[PDB]
Nucleic acid binder design. Structure first.
Ligand SMILES: [Mn+2]
Ligand SMILES: [Mn+2]
Ligand SMILES: [Mn+2]
Length: 327
DNA sequence: CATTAGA
DNA sequence: TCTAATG
């Protein structure tokens, strides 16, 4: 957590690079398991040799650790950090729509900067187009204050279109966070669950709503179950407009909400841990259900849920307010 | 780890 | 169809 820090971070830098600037899936995969194990080991690695004892630790990375231990740095690391191309790739990457594949291609074409991308708006797609559009506000955090404002309007039309809806705005917001990166809207409807062969419109009706009122402003992607967009809060009585916000709305079978709710609400750890416990408790939890375990090794059969509580009662735990689902 | 775009 | 990019 800290006695093995420099090593871990260095490695992951090492790993993140192979994946991105290069295509080295494997090396990258390499640096990761290593960067993983070395993180677990309870003592101060004092030499590669020592590291090397480890699993996934080869001559390659161990060599790497000596150098880092020996001298406060690493050239390979220093070289990359300098490398304009590779820099370039990391950069373009921030552009929502942009991935490594693109990055690279873009770079090869010579598009390396913000401006580059502009000049060639043609070379980019709608997503990427949008991404480029709202790059600044896309990297901006969302104050709860706003979060509050957003969730309000949203439940608002949700309600309006059909009173039979259920929306929850999950994530850290849901968890109390003083700020969020985007807004995550979970959605369901009685008239939609497991078997009841859809009602795409169900999703459809809302986005449309939000749009008509100006909440929704662009479309990153619209599917019959997962919309992905951009939104904004009505820029008040002037002098202050709002940044373009990333938002996601998703449809869900009323029969699997709460799990998914539970889940997407986190925290990553809270979940893992709760889930771990459900294992002892003779259960199985996952993004959609909760199945009781059969000693044969495994089992099935989706226990019925109607609330965040049921899942809890099931594994006989303490209801944790989402406030404190921190871990 | 599944959904969406796209080419 | 595949492949990329999001989460
Ligand atoms: Mn070994
Ligand atoms: Mn990006
Ligand atoms: Mn998200």
């Amino acid at each position: 957590e800290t006695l093995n820090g420099g090593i871990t971070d260095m490695l992951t830098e090492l790993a993140n690079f192979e994946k991105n600037v290069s295509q080295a899936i494997h090396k990258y995969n390499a640096y990761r398991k290593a960067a993983s194990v070395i993180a677990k080991y309870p003592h101060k690695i004092k030499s590669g040799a020592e590291a090397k004892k480890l699993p996934g630790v080869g001559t390659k990375i161990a060599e790497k650790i000596d150098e880092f231990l020996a001298t406060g740095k690493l050239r390979k690391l220093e070289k990359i950090r300098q490398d304009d191309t590779s820099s370039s790739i990391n950069f373009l990457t921030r552009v929502s729509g942009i991935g490594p594949s693109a990055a690279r291609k873009f770079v090869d074409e010579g598009i390396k900067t913000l401006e580059d991308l502009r000049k060639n708006e043609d070379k980019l797609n709608h997503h990427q187009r949008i991404g480029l559009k709202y790059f600044g506000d896309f990297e901006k955090r969302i104050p709860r204050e706003e979060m509050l404002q957003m969730q309000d309007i949203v439940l608002n039309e949700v309600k309006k279109v059909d009173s039979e809806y259920i929306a929850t705005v999950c994530g850290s917001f849901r968890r109390g966070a003083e700020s969020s990166g985007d807004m995550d809207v979970l959605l369901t409807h009685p008239s939609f669950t497991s078997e009841s062969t859809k009602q795409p419109k169900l999703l459809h009706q809302v986005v449309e709503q939000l749009q008509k009122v100006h909440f929704i402003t662009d479309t990153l992607s619209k599917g019959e179950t997962k919309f992905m967009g951009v939104c904004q809060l009505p820029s008040k009585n002037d002098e202050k407009e709002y940044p373009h916000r990333r938002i996601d709305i998703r449809l869900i079978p009323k029969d699997q909400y709460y799990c998914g709710v539970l889940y997407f609400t986190g925290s990553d750890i809270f979940n893992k841990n709760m889930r771990a416990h459900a294992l002892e408790k003779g259960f199985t939890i996952n993004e959609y259900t909760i199945r009781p375990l059969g000693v044969t090794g495994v089992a099935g059969e989706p226990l019925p849920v109607d609330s965040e509580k049921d899942i809890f009662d099931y594994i006989q735990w303490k209801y944790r307010e989402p406030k404190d689902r921190s871990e």
